[PDB]
Amino acid sequence: GSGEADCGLRPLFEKKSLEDKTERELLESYIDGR
Amino acid sequence: YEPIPEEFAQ
Amino acid sequence: IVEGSDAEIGMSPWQVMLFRKSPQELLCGASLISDRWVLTAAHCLLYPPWDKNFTENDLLVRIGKHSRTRYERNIEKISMLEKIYIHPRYNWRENLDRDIALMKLKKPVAFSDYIHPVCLPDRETAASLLQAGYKGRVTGWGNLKETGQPSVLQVVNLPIVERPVCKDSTRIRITDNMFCAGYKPDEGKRGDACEGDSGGPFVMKSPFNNRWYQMGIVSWGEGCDRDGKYGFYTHVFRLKKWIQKVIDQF
Ligand SMILES: N=C(N)c1ccc(CNC(=O)C2(NC(=O)[C@@H](CC3CCCCC3)NCC(=O)O)CCCC2)cn1
């Protein structure tokens, strides 16, 4: 949508369902922790 | 910095 | 980047390096938001206090990089600028309010495994993620200490800070088009952006659709990674309308 289809989806990660070393620290903070 | 090729200097 | 670590290959396919033609040196970070536009901080191109006023034919854009000083043949792509656009109300005189600029590339760039665009936020995404405590990621080839450089692209994850705390940490008048981030002195961890990271992207991964969105741009700070001090970023969503404007006009 607001940002062409495909934007934000990295070829070497999201596109192959692979996580990078620290992206989880980010998602875990989206509720209460930090 | 390593020099970049000339064809890119416009 | 201070107290960060080496980014892994293809970790930030939208990271852009603003490169000076003469002398050949690093200028700023920036980001790819489409195949023809890169976003950056206005102070990277214009800042009268230091006589800095760059034009299109003064710089080069290097996309798909990892190494800071090597010409990564076959991987990185070098593009020329067709036109630069500074926000008409960019305030370099007082507090760097509206520190933002758009750059139109001479030719559309071809995407790859190392070159891909980041997403721009919408009202909903910004409202969900732009909250105190929520961490974001900054990347750049900037300095590692306030007062050597990195060999490879650096990256840190920092938490967004409450507006009040941001205001009480500086004498600089803070506006709505800004937001600060960093760990507090008692939080144990640390890290921050620094000289040379300017223009770089502050991104967050949406837990709703799995995409990465650029919420901020590395704008300014007082020193680098000092206790009680935080890095400030240009609030991308607040300036989103100026962005769309510039894009459909040119
Ligand atoms: N998160 C950080 N710690 C951080 C530090 C440095 C930078 C890069 N940008 C700069 O250095 C610029 N200057 C600065 O940050 C200034 C503070 C500015 C506040 C707004 C009005 C002008 C002065 N601090 C220098 C320092 O005390 O060092 C130069 C032109 C304007 C920005 C980006 N982020």
Side-chain angles (χ1 to χ4, degrees):
Chain A
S2 190
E4 70 162 297
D6 216 18
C7 69
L9 260 26
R10 302 170 298 176
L12 297 183
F13 292 93
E14 284 79 15
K15 242 53 182 296
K16 304 196 295 181
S17 221
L18 254 33
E19 292 188 338
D20 67 49
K21 295 187 209 61
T22 57
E23 71 178 76
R24 213 181 310 95
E25 162 185 30
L26 258 47
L27 285 295
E28 306 182 317
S29 70
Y30 298 152
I31 326 187
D32 40 54
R34 191 172 301 181
Chain B
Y1 298 89
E2 182 184 308
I4 70 182
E6 181 234 301
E7 59 266 33
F8 293 121
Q10 278 58 64
Chain C
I1 303 298
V2 181
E3 290 305 319
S5 55
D6 293 359
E8 44 201 312
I9 308 294
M11 181 186 219
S12 292
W14 42 74
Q15 180 68 45
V16 177
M17 179 190 279
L18 256 53
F19 200 72
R20 214 187 155 170
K21 288 184 182 179
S22 176
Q24 275 178 54
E25 40 167 38
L26 173 60
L27 223 69
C28 269
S31 74
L32 189 68
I33 56 180
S34 75
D35 70 315
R36 251 265 181 168
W37 299 87
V38 341
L39 192 59
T40 191
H43 76 268
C44 286
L45 309 167
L46 214 197
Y47 193 58
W50 297 348
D51 285 295
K52 184 161 66 178
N53 182 178
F54 294 116
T55 63
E56 290 77 35
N57 296 70
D58 271 297
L59 342 127
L60 284 179
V61 154
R62 305 179 63 177
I63 319 176
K65 295 195 60 62
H66 179 63
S67 179
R68 167 184 140 258
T69 69
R70 324 296 200 287
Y71 168 55
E72 316 183 86
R73 183 163 48 101
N74 281 176
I75 304 184
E76 79 173 87
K77 222 109 294 292
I78 303 180
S79 179
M80 292 179 283
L81 299 171
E82 182 191 297
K83 237 295 176 285
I84 291 179
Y85 305 78
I86 312 292
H87 191 294
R89 303 185 68 188
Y90 157 48
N91 195 348
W92 53 270
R93 294 177 155 287
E94 183 185 353
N95 55 0
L96 230 56
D97 186 32
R98 301 196 187 73
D99 191 7
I100 185 165
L102 284 166
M103 297 188 260
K104 166 83 113 61
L105 266 40
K106 265 199 169 62
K107 231 181 313 299
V109 153
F111 298 154
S112 72
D113 287 347
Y114 321 96
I115 300 176
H116 200 78
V118 76
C119 300
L120 255 38
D122 58 357
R123 159 149 289 185
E124 305 62 73
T125 297
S128 302
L129 289 1
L130 219 49
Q131 303 191 70
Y134 285 29
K135 290 176 180 174
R137 175 179 290 174
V138 189
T139 50
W141 293 282
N143 298 331
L144 301 170
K145 48 191 180 184
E146 192 179 317
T147 186
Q149 289 203 288
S151 173
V152 129
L153 180 72
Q154 299 297 286
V155 46
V156 239
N157 292 155
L158 302 165
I160 284 180
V161 188
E162 306 79 356
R163 185 157 294 275
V165 183
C166 298
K167 282 177 186 295
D168 288 342
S169 66
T170 183
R171 293 210 211 191
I172 298 302
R173 186 176 62 79
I174 300 313
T175 76
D176 279 352
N177 309 123
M178 297 171 212
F179 77 80
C180 84
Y183 290 109
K184 310 192 197 304
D186 75 58
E187 280 181 347
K189 297 117 144 297
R190 58 197 311 129
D192 185 23
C194 196
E195 238 212 66
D197 291 322
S198 300
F202 179 91
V203 297
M204 294 176 99
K205 183 168 180 169
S206 172
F208 301 105
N209 62 3
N210 269 284
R211 296 174 183 253
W212 288 88
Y213 289 90
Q214 165 162 20
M215 309 300 292
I217 302 177
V218 181
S219 181
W220 61 274
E222 302 167 302
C224 294
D225 194 53
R226 296 203 207 145
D227 305 75
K229 289 292 181 175
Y230 310 88
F232 284 77
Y233 306 75
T234 304
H235 197 310
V236 178
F237 177 65
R238 288 283 191 285
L239 296 165
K240 176 73 168 301
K241 291 172 184 55
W242 170 71
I243 293 172
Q244 286 165 180
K245 253 178 295 184
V246 171
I247 292 179
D248 16 84
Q249 313 305 293
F250 309 101

